[PDB]
Symmetry: C3
Subunit: 36 residues, 3 copies
Amino acid sequence: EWEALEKKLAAXESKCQALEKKLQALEKKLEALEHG
Amino acid sequence: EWEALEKKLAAXESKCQALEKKLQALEKKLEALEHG
Amino acid sequence: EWEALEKKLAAXESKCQALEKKLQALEKKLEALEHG
Ligand SMILES: [Zn+2]
Ligand SMILES: [Zn+2]
Ligand SMILES: [Zn+2]
């Protein structure tokens, strides 16, 4: 299913970008603890 | 290689889902420190 | 665009692998705090 694969890849991209931002948010909190 | 691309995309999905759960597990530990 | 989808999937893979390593790096720092 070609069109379904295109959409799956786009969802792939969205989920990774959301995880990158969630990792940055946790890094901010961890750094506050590390330098507190 | 069409069939190889389908499988690569499925592995893609599995790895992201595993990373999302690993991020949740680290968030739990960080929150315990933040509110300790 | 078949060739563009192949490349997008490869970028997908690279970004997940980079995020896995970033999560490991944050886990190392969190563990230092947790056992400090
Ligand atoms: Zn630091
Ligand atoms: Zn908190
Ligand atoms: Zn620990």
